[PDB]
Design an enzyme around this catalytic site. Structure first.
Site, PDB file in Angstrom:
ATOM      1  N   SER A   1      51.396  36.136  28.827  1.00  0.00           N
ATOM      2  CA  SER A   1      50.674  36.142  30.093  1.00  0.00           C
ATOM      3  C   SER A   1      49.905  34.832  30.275  1.00  0.00           C
ATOM      4  CB  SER A   1      49.744  37.352  30.162  1.00  0.00           C
ATOM      5  OG  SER A   1      49.236  37.532  31.470  1.00  0.00           O
TER       6      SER A   1
ATOM      7  N   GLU B   1      56.745  44.524  34.741  1.00  0.00           N
ATOM      8  CA  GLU B   1      55.675  43.529  34.805  1.00  0.00           C
ATOM      9  C   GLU B   1      54.463  43.916  35.665  1.00  0.00           C
ATOM     10  OE1 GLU B   1      54.983  40.936  33.053  1.00  0.00           O
ATOM     11  OE2 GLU B   1      56.802  40.741  31.849  1.00  0.00           O
TER      12      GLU B   1
ATOM     13  N   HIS C   1      53.183  45.187  31.423  1.00  0.00           N
ATOM     14  CA  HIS C   1      52.765  43.850  31.028  1.00  0.00           C
ATOM     15  C   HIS C   1      52.030  43.920  29.677  1.00  0.00           C
ATOM     16  CE1 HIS C   1      51.840  39.672  31.884  1.00  0.00           C
ATOM     17  NE2 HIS C   1      50.540  39.887  31.781  1.00  0.00           N
TER      18      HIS C   1
HETATM   19  C1  LIG Z   1      46.397  40.019  28.023  1.00  0.00           C
HETATM   20  C2  LIG Z   1      47.334  41.213  27.978  1.00  0.00           C
HETATM   21  N1  LIG Z   1      47.161  42.214  29.097  1.00  0.00           N
HETATM   22  C3  LIG Z   1      48.256  43.258  29.031  1.00  0.00           C
HETATM   23  C4  LIG Z   1      48.056  44.426  29.995  1.00  0.00           C
HETATM   24  C5  LIG Z   1      45.789  42.907  28.980  1.00  0.00           C
HETATM   25  C6  LIG Z   1      44.961  42.645  30.239  1.00  0.00           C
HETATM   26  N2  LIG Z   1      44.994  41.265  30.769  1.00  0.00           N
HETATM   27  S1  LIG Z   1      45.778  40.905  32.195  1.00  0.00           S
HETATM   28  O1  LIG Z   1      47.070  41.468  32.067  1.00  0.00           O
HETATM   29  O2  LIG Z   1      45.703  39.507  32.402  1.00  0.00           O
HETATM   30  C7  LIG Z   1      44.990  41.687  33.497  1.00  0.00           C
HETATM   31  C8  LIG Z   1      45.280  43.011  33.791  1.00  0.00           C
HETATM   32  C9  LIG Z   1      44.685  43.728  34.814  1.00  0.00           C
HETATM   33  C10 LIG Z   1      43.740  43.124  35.615  1.00  0.00           C
HETATM   34  O3  LIG Z   1      43.150  43.821  36.628  1.00  0.00           O
HETATM   35  C11 LIG Z   1      41.990  43.344  37.212  1.00  0.00           C
HETATM   36  C12 LIG Z   1      40.718  43.561  36.627  1.00  0.00           C
HETATM   37 CL1  LIG Z   1      40.566  44.360  35.142  1.00  0.00          CL
HETATM   38  C13 LIG Z   1      39.546  43.130  37.213  1.00  0.00           C
HETATM   39  C14 LIG Z   1      39.596  42.469  38.430  1.00  0.00           C
HETATM   40  C15 LIG Z   1      40.822  42.236  39.048  1.00  0.00           C
HETATM   41  C16 LIG Z   1      42.008  42.681  38.443  1.00  0.00           C
HETATM   42  N3  LIG Z   1      43.247  42.322  39.237  1.00  0.00           N
HETATM   43  O4  LIG Z   1      44.288  42.156  38.682  1.00  0.00           O
HETATM   44  O5  LIG Z   1      43.112  42.164  40.458  1.00  0.00           O
HETATM   45  C17 LIG Z   1      43.410  41.799  35.365  1.00  0.00           C
HETATM   46  C18 LIG Z   1      44.026  41.125  34.327  1.00  0.00           C
END
Ligand SMILES: CCN(CC)CCNS(=O)(=O)c1ccc(Oc2c(Cl)cccc2[N+](=O)[O-])cc1
Ligand SMILES: CCN(CC)CCNS(=O)(=O)c1ccc(Oc2c(Cl)cccc2[N+](=O)[O-])cc1
Ligand SMILES: CCN(CC)CCNS(=O)(=O)c1ccc(Oc2c(Cl)cccc2[N+](=O)[O-])cc1
Ligand SMILES: CCN(CC)CCNS(=O)(=O)c1ccc(Oc2c(Cl)cccc2[N+](=O)[O-])cc1
Ligand SMILES: *[C@@H]1O[C@H](CO)[C@@H](O)[C@H](O)[C@H]1NC(C)=O
Ligand SMILES: *[C@@H]1O[C@H](CO)[C@@H](O)[C@H](O)[C@H]1NC(C)=O
Ligand SMILES: *[C@H]1O[C@H](CO)[C@@H](O)[C@H](O)[C@H]1NC(C)=O
Ligand SMILES: *[C@H]1O[C@H](CO)[C@@H](O)[C@H](O)[C@H]1NC(C)=O
Lengths: 534, 535
Positions: free
Chosen positions: A200, A325, A438
């Site tokens: 990622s 994904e 993902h």
């Molecule tokens: C690094 C591996 N990954 C696998 C799932 C763990 C999570 N990291 S990630 O995949 O970048 C990730 C996943 C979900 C996310 O959701 C949010 C959140 Cl929490 C807050 C605010 C906004 C969002 N959004 O996407 O709009 C953000 C980053």
């Protein structure tokens, strides 16, 4: 005093710890500082190399996690918690970890360097799924992972200023890479064979090291799991970074560049994290507030310009995606979605969720998307809409960005292997509808099924061994194929002509052609012409 | 009279007729050929609505086909059977408003459902006298009463200075409607049932049928309709009042000509001069575009066909619609460089891009880009064979398959009983090259039952297949349902609905039911392009 645990690097002496892996012991060196603590006046600034130390530094313990936002959507749920910081938060976080076999390798050994993801706002090298002991024990690898600054602390930028030039989180990684060049030989590592791998945001970082010339002399091969430097979320323009930084300062109460960054330095860490999300231009998912910036320094031009024109002759890359994904992200912003139900959506919610999953889309561009993803045989059917919503997010953000990168690299002389990961963990805690989300190939690459007490199935264990083999064979040679093994069908290079990729799952390798070719042509070739007609 | 066959003498409103006893493979049929149904639209009547034929004295001989409406004659492949079969087979004249009738011999005892054929040919060509429109097989084998009419084509049929009285436009359509009224008054004299009349036509003929469904005065003249590879909606079947004016005005200039003065000067022109310059008024280099076609006059067509089908009530309307497997291929040899019947037509990517602009002449650069991106095979973007077949599909989908899909989709949703098919059998006797697949217009010979003719060298399976088709069409004419009432053991043909989108394949094999009429691709043309073009 175990002499296998005693190592002298350029900064002084270190004591590691002997850890137990299922098949034997491994030497672990945890918490090794590679930079001066980026605190106080050092906040937002490039890292500086760690001063030498006296005596024997205790490197038997994981160090602090870089200060970051801690997720709260599902409190205490193992599916989200497994990604949350498993140590104390601190701005003082620039430390790396090294695993080697025990006893230390006699011959110089290929090095794998892991760079975690987390949207450039989160992540830590101490997470249980990043445990390098399995690859070190079983494959005899030397494995390295570093913490790098995330969020405002690693990527807030007033482009052109001296006290917040941006991309410092990337420089943290670059410094850790220099550290490996200068020190890894003392662990039995081969500095002339260094493979970067990341997932990622980490895959994106690896990507940017490919595209930033000063990083190029610090590694030889790259693996990008479900992330690219190109695409809609991994970079911002100097103009947009400046807007967000200025807005954040306004939200927390803050030479005008200089005075602004000074007031920010007086702010408690948690005060910046509190408003971190409030600076996004539109309601969105898969968008992050503070990410690498096109400064004309680290990144001389945009990633697309760079991949479209770069010369990648002597490069070897392994790239890929998981089956589902976008699914993980939907529960994080798109009305209708939850892990606690089947998330069957109406057509209305699908339209609404498309403006969210493609926040930058004009009315007409979003119309184009909705029309492409609707199954006109079943245009109203909830299961299809839910599955298509997830495909829109995954394709826009990962799959098509990946396909574009694989294509540009292959055309311009690079050696490319592409995969899609299709096995859903038997131990997975998310609902069935999310499929293979993902990030859930990681636990397999790192060897976790080999731990009996995790209760993975025998087949899953056999499978994890297969993947560690591909990755480490790729690290050894730039080719994930076993060198003397015949049988087990061969993994062919991805090329522009044949577009061959393979499926990673419980069945033998299977070769497929074209990575969502028609759909990615829509994202990669048509949509840009459309949005540019606005 | 005295010594003639008494089964061949018949009186209609205009006077007495003598027909002819034709041989068909299974027995005799009665043909009444060359019955005039309107005053000859010549001289000061050129461009005018037809006036009803004035009664004649004596017994009109109706044993031969009459003049073919003045029209452009195809020169692409001289003497080649595949084109010639569509060319005029009688003398060309502006005096050409005649119709033909075939009936069982002797004429049926009880009132028999009537079938009315409307030929296609892009509103610039066609004739009811073509071999492939021979109603003798339907009449003998199914007992059908078959009526086909000539109607004015080209300038004479469709040149319009909208709003004027001297050339109001659509007079070609009014020719057709007059024949429909003729059938209402007269068909019972042949044993036809005027209360059971089914229109059927192919290509432009199909569009014509569609226009009659959408035009109030035509509606009481028929009960059921079949549209084969053509629709009133779509990119070629109509032009706006504005565009028709521009084309009439330009054609006038090209032949040396206040609307009255203009039209009066045109009426002085030899018919061949108007024909010689007919193609020269098209706005762009194109294929599947025709200069003089029905105009949206707000009279015959009160609004655009698109508006009308989107907003009309169609309760108690029954329609059969369908397409051949390769609607587009025929058109490519008449305009897209790289294509010929004499080679495999393997084109380059470049030729594909050029060809898209020609086959989608009304597309902006961006819309054209979208078509190319949609139709490109990205696993083999440079493959000549895919590119050739993609070109055919672009033309076929844009012009026929997707207008038909839109039609069937709107009608079904708005109350109509709709039956849909795709015709997939390539005639063993076809003279066009293999690459062209099953081209536009090659279902016709099967519907009319030509394979039953022994001398034509079709196969036994083609004979049996032809018979199945004649039953579907005739059963539909009789009942509004193509299925045989008795024959329930044989696979059923379900109605097309919005929910299930069912249609059948028509080939040498038993009826196979499929779902979705190019559903995804037609979403592109029917839903997305109009959004894009209007920006
Ligand atoms: C690094 C591996 N990954 C696998 C799932 C763990 C999570 N990291 S990630 O995949 O970048 C990730 C996943 C979900 C996310 O959701 C949010 C959140 Cl929490 C807050 C605010 C906004 C969002 N959004 O996407 O709009 C953000 C980053
Ligand atoms: C003001 C500009 N337009 S806006 O629509 O209000 C807006 C602004 C910022 C936003 O960021 C957030 C926030 Cl704060 C909380 C949670 C999630 C997100 N996100 O987008 O992932 C969302 C919407
Ligand atoms: C800028 N427009 S143009 O290229 O001059 C143009 C306009 C109309 C044309 O009409 C013809 C003619 Cl004349 C002959 C044969 C076929 C067609 N056609 O369009 O199908 C041909 C070229
Ligand atoms: C009605 C049955 N049909 C079956 C193929 C026979 C012929 N009528 S048709 O199908 O509308 C038809 C087919 C091809 C045509 O090509 C021409 C020609 Cl010939 C001349 C000038 C311009 C073009 N063009 O399209 O640009 C025209 C009409
Ligand atoms: C299976 O693994 C779990 C950890 O996930 C462990 O706690 C447990 O003792 C193991 N066996 C069972 C089901 O008791
Ligand atoms: C049919 O076949 C015969 C030869 O058996 C041939 O002489 C005749 O010309 C053919 N007819 C047609 C129309 O092809
Ligand atoms: C589960 O999804 C449904 C909509 O399909 C919705 O009611 C709800 O937001 C989700 N979960 C809960 C209980 O909040
Ligand atoms: C057919 O041959 C090629 C395509 O294979 C094409 O370029 C050419 O124009 C055609 N030949 C003729 C005689 O027009």
């Amino acid at each position: 005093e175990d002499p296998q645990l005693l190592v002298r690097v350029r900064g002084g002496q270190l004591r590691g710890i002997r850890l137990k892996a299922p098949g034997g012991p491994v030497s672990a060196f945890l918490g090794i500082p590679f930079a001066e603590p980026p605190v106080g006046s050092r906040r937002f600034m490039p890292p500086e190399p760690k001063r030498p130390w006296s005596g024997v530094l205790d490197a038997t313990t994981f160090q602090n996690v870089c200060y970051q936002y801690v997720d709260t959507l599902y409190p205490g749920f193992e599916g989200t918690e497994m990604w949350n910081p498993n140590r104390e938060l601190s701005e003082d976080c620039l430390y790396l970890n090294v695993w080697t076999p025990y006893p230390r390798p006699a011959s110089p050994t290929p090095v794998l360097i892991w760079i975690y993801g987390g949207g450039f706002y989160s992540g830590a090298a101490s997470l249980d799924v990043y445990d390098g002991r399995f690859l070190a024990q079983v494959e005899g690898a030397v494995l390295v992972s570093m913490n790098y600054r995330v969020g405002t602390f690693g990527f807030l930028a007033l482009p052109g200023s001296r006290e917040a030039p941006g991309n410092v989180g990337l420089l943290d990684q670059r410094l850790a890479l220099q550290w490996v060049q200068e020190n890894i030989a003392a662990f039995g590592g081969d500095p002339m064979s260094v493979t970067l791998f990341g997932e990622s945001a980490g895959a994106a970082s690896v990507g940017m090291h490919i595209l930033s010339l000063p990083s190029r002399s610090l590694f030889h091969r790259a693996v990008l799991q479900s992330g690219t430097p190109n695409g809609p979320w991994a970079t911002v323009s100097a103009g947009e970074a400046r807007r967000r930084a200025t807005l954040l300062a306004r939200l927390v109460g803050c030479g005008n560049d200089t005075e602004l960054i000074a007031c920010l330095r007086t702010r408690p860490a948690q005060d910046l994290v509190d408003h971190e999300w409030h600076v996004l231009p539109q309601e969105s998912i898969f968008r992050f507030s503070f990410v690498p910036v096109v400064d004309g320094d680290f990144l001389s031009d945009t990633p697309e310009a760079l991949i479209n024109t770069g010369d990648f002759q002597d490069l070897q890359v392994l790239v890929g995606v998981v089956k589902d994904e976008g699914s993980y992200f939907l529960v994080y912003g798109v009305p209708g979605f939850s892990k606690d139900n089947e998330s069957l959506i109406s057509r209305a919610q699908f339209l609404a969720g498309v403006r969210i999953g493609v926040p930058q889309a004009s009315d007409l561009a979003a119309e184009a998307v909705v029309l492409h993803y609707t199954d006109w045989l079943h245009p109203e059917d909830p299961t299809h809409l839910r599955d298509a919503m997830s495909a829109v997010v995954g394709d826009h953000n990962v799959v098509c960005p990946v396909a574009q990168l694989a294509g540009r690299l292959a055309a311009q002389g690079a050696r490319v292997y592409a995969y899609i990961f299709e096995h859903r963990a038997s131990t997975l805690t998310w609902p069935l509808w999310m499929g293979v989300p993902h990030g859930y190939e990681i636990e397999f690459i790192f060897g976790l099924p080999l731990d009996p007490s995790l209760n993975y199935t025998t087949e899953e264990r056999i499978f994890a061994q297969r993947l560690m083999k591909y990755w480490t064979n790729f690290a050894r040679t730039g080719d994930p194929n076993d060198p003397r093994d015949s049988k087990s069908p061969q993994w062919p290079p991805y090329t522009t002509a044949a577009q061959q990729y393979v499926s990673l799952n419980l069945k033998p390798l299977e070769v497929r052609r074209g990575l969502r070719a028609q759909t990615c042509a829509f994202w990669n070739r048509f949509l840009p012409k459309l949005l540019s007609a606005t």
